[PDB]
Amino acid sequence: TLVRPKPLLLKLLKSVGAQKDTYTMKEVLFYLGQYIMTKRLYDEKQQHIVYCSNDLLGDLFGVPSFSVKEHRKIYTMIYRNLVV
Amino acid sequence: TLVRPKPLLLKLLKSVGAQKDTYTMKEVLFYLGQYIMTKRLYDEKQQHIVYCSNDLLGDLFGVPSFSVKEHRKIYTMIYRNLVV
């Protein structure tokens, strides 16, 4: 299933070089992971911890932080930012 | 098209958490990029430069270094490490 990011999420994907306006969910996740690593928003020590306050990513989530283990939260963020 | 990594390339994909023995080429590329970032094998200053000597990745390539701009070289490395 192709999904269609809303504009802010699209800006995030473009910032790591994604070149399309539709992607699979797997691809959206891949690009989001590239973005988090690029911006080093994860804790070097315990690398599931992400701090995203005042980042574009924090605006998408509406939260200052999350753990990568919070799969419901992450999937829900993504869906809130898709044109379904 | 699904591709089937040979053992050393499979070890590299497993090291970032890939959980399958077949993937698309796009997926192989995604995981390889995750590996390079994780191991910080790219130059912080000019981020297309990768130094991989004495790393698992250098053994796959058979070279100590490459630029990400060398697309023929990178694709050829991958194919040399697939069960076709």
Binding site: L29, G33, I36, V68, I74 | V16, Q34, T38
Partner: peptide, 11 residues
């Protein structure tokens, strides 16, 4: 466990 390892569990 690296970030990528945790992140890949999402898919």
């Amino acid at each position: 466990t690296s970030f990528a390892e945790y992140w890949n569990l999402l898919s």
